[model samples]
Target: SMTSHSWLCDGRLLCLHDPSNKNNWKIFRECWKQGQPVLVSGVHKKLKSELWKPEAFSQEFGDQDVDLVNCRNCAIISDVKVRDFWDGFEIICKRLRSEDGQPMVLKLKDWPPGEDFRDMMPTRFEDLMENLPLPEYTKRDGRLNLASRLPSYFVRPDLGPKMYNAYGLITAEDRRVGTTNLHLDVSDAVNVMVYVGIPIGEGAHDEEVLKTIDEGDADEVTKERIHDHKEKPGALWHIYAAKDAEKIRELLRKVGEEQGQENPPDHDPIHDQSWYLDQTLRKRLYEEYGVQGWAIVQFLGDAVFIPAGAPHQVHNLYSCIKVAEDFVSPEHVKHCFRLT
Candidate 1:
C-alpha cells in the first residue's frame, strides 16, 4: 500500500520547545491530555556527552559485561564483554543487511547489567544526572511529574526518585529485525537519543533497504559515520492512543486468525512483544478499523515522550544509543492509578 520510507509517511504532531521556554510545562500538558506521543526537539544541545561515539563506550566501559538482546526474537540472547561486542559491531550490522549470513543480531543493553548505573559509574552518572535531557519533565518533584507525588515505599519498587532509568545500545539494519517490538509501558517515559549513526554510502529509505535484504547483498553497506545523522531521523516510532488498546488487540488477533491461531490459552498478543506492524498492516489497520497511529520521526537529540499505556513500537533506521526515564504526570494519573 505504501512505497516510500515509512519514516517519510504523513503523521507528525507538532514538537515542543526545550527547557529554555518557560511555558514548556503547559505545552507538554496540552499534548499529554490529548494522549499523543510528544516529540521535544533540540534537547541534546543543552547536554554534552562523549558517549555518542560507539568507540567512546569501548574506551570507557569496555571491560564491563552486559546483556545483549537479539532484535529478531526480542529476548536476551547472551552475555559478552562490552569491548568484544564493539570490536565486532560492524560485523553484526553487515550481517543484518544481507540474507547470506547468520541471523544473530545482538547489541549491548542494561549496561552495568543488573546493577544501578549511578552506583557503578558515579562520575559519569553524576554528569548524566545533572545534565538529563528535559529537566522540566524529569525533575524529581516537579508539578507535572507524578512519580514524585508518591511516598518512598511505593515508588521504590517502581524505580522512581532513586537509582537510574533504562540505558540502552540500539542497532538495526532492516525493518523485519526491529530494535523493539510492539508493547506498552506502565509509566509515562521519555527516551533521549544521545547518539545516532548512519550507514555511509548510499542513503536509502524504507522500501529500498528492504530490497537489499531480499536480494542477499552483504557488501552493499560499506561503512558508517557517527553524529552525522543529525536532523536526519534515527528511529521510526508508531504510537497508538491509550483508549485504542482494544482495537490493536483486535487487529492482532485478527492477524493471528489468518496465521492459524485462535487465542491460545496462555499467550499474550501485546505483552509477548510480538507482531511488528509493517506498512501493509498499518494500512489494513486504518482501512478496516479507522485506527491510524502517530508515525513519529525521532531525530538525534530528540526526546520521544510516550504516554502511559500507549501501544508503541520502534524501528531504528541506523545504529543508535539512548536513555529512557519514566515519570508520572497529572493528566495521565488515572492510568498511573491503574498501574499502581
Candidate 2:
C-alpha cells in the first residue's frame, strides 16, 4: 500500500495504521488504557477512519511530509506556497478519501456538525442515556426556567446543590426555547467550530478585547458593527479552501505579532470568533473578489471529553464532550498522564 502524508509531515490518518496495527502501538494501546482482550492483526486498520481532514489540508501542501512536533522540520517548499506556519497541520491532513470512505482527516469547519456531541448534550432528551456521570443536584427539575450551568471550578463551594445551566435566549418572535450559549467544562476537551470565512483586519471581535487605541469613527463603527452582526447572524460566513493558504498565513502571522502571542506559531487560532471568520476569508480570497473566508456554522456544543484540563467559553446555550481523535489510543493516556 502507498504511504500517505500531510504537508506538515504528521502521518496521514491511515499512514501509521498499516505499520502498527498489532494492537500494541503505544499510542493505540494508551487510548483504551486497560489491557486488550486479545491482540488482533487488523484492529488498528479500521481505526484510521477517524482522523481529521480539512480542505485547508490540501491547498497548503499536496502530499508532502513534514514533522509536526518540530515545525521547522517539514515546511512546505514547492510550487504551492503556504506562508503561515500555523496552518501547517491542515496542509498535510487533507486527503481525497481513505479506504473506509471517510476523509483521513477531521475538520469542524461546518456550521453545525451533525450530531456533534457538544451541541446535543444539553437540550436533547436522548443524550441523558450516554452514561456520563454528573452530580445529583445538576439534573433538570422537569420545569423550564432559563439558566446556564458551570463546570467544576466555577461552582460555588458554599452551594450544596449541583450546578445547572442558567442562560436563556430572547427571540424576536416572542418565543424562545434555548440560547446559542455553549458551555465548556474544565476538561481536556477542545471545542471545534467550523468557520467559513475570516473577518477583515478591522472587523475581528478581538479588536474589542484589545486596548482601545486612536481610531476614526468609521473604524470604530466597523468593529462595533461586526460585534452586533455576530450577535444578529448573517453579516459574514463561509467555508475553508486550499487556494488562499498564503493570504491566510499572512494574516495569522500579523495577528500573532499584534497579540504578542506567547506561542504564536501554534496552529490553534487565538480568539475563535475572529479566527474562524478569517479562515472563511481564506476560502474565498482567491476566487471571489472581495470574498473573505467561508462561513462555518458550528452547531455549538459542550467541550472535549477528556478529564480536568481547561474551562470552555460561554455561549448561547450549547454544550459538548471531548472525544479523542482515536478514542481508543495511547494519546488519550498521554493526556491523562501528561506524558506526551
Candidate 3:
C-alpha cells in the first residue's frame, strides 16, 4: 500500500494505475494544459520474475568494453570492462565511494555506443524495446513524436531513432554530484522508473520506508537490491512550467551573479547546467518567486509524463534504472516552438 509522495512541500502528481482507466489520457491532456506531470504505478510489478535487473545485465555483458563518466565533470573517467563498472553493483555504496569516503558519482550512458536503436544490447534489445511499459498514445511509430515526424531532409545527420540509457548510483550529497540538474527538453517526455535500490541501512527515515512498503511486497530484484532494507524514495523531481521559466531564470542568475559569475552565458544557470536547487534552494524559490513547481517522488514502476519546454531536474535517492521516451504532444508543441 505504499503510495507516491510530493517532494518537500511542493505539489504531488496525479497518480493512476497501470491498467488505468480508458479516459486516463483525457486526464493527462488536462494536466498538460497546466504543465503538471502524471505518475502511474504497477507498470512493471506483475512481471516479477523476468524484470530488468542489474544482475541480468552483468551476466550478459560482463566482459564487454564500456565507458564510465564522472558525474562531477561530465567527462569519461575511463574505458573499463563492463564488469569493472557493474561489479560495483554487488556492494554499490562501498564501491561507489572513494578511499577517502566521498561519494563517487559515475554514470554509464550511451551503451552500445551507436545511433541505431536496433543495435542496442543485441541480446536483450527485443526484450526491452518491445516490452518496456510505455504510454499507449505514443508508439514508436506514432505521429506524436516530433523526432519521428521530422522531414527526411533533416534526417541525414541525426541522433537517430536511438534510445540510450544513463544508469548509476550516488549517496546523498550537497553539490548535485550525481543528480540530473535543471534543464528542459525541446519535446515532451514520459520517464519511467524500471528498477530501484537503496544501500543497506541507508536511505529514508523509518516512517517514510515503513509506509512505502508492506511485508512480502518486495520482488526478487527489489530484495536483491535492498536486502532487508525497506523501499525508500527512488528520485525527486522538480518540474517548472514553461510559463514560469523566467522566474526560475531570474533566481538561478541571481545566485550565479552572487558567486561572481561574469559575462555569463545567455541562459546563465540553466545554460551552464551547474546548479541543482536542493532543499534550501527549493525553499528560497517558493518564498522569493512564489514558484513551487511540481515536486514529485518517483518510485519503482512509476511513470512521469512531462510537458514540452518545462524545465525540470531529478535527484535520485540511490541506485536506479530509469528509461524515458520523448514525444511531441499536439497540445504542447506551441511551447516547444517557443523555446530558444
lDDT of 1 by residue, 1-340 (tens): 5221111223345466453456566555665788877777675676666644667667887887666665665666455577765644433443233244553545566665444655655665554456554465665555567675666433321442222112122323345555677898767887777776654323343344334222211112111211333264566678889898878888888889898986874456888787788767878888998986876656677777888889988766556666666777766656645333
lDDT of 3 by residue, 1-340 (tens): 6433222222345666642444566555665677676766665554343546777767877887877766656667566777666656435454555457755556666665665445654534454444433345444565445556654432212343333234333333322443577887767777767676554434343344332222212233333434454444576677887888878889888887888877555665675667777666777788999986765666777777778778887755556677666666667666545234
Q: List where candidate 2 sits over 4 angstroms from the true fold.
A: 1-253, 258-331, 336-340
Angstrom error of the Cα, residue 227, model 2: value is 26
lDDT of 3 at 10: 27
* Clash-forming residue pairs, model 3: none
For model 1, the superposed segments whose C-alpha errors exceed 4 Å read 1-12, 73-76, 90-104, 132-136, 151-157, 160-173, 199-230, 265-267, 338-340
For model 3 the TM-score comes to: 0.76
List TM-score per model, in order: 0.76, 0.21, 0.76
Question: Backbone collision count in every prediction?
Answer: 1, 74, 0
Per-residue C-alpha lDDT of model 2 across residues 52-126, encoded as one tens digit per residue? 222333343334432211111112222222222224222323322335553222111211223443442233222
Question: In model 3, how large is the Cα lDDT of residue 105?
Answer: 59
* Clashes, model 1: 1
Give the number of the best model, judged by lDDT: 1
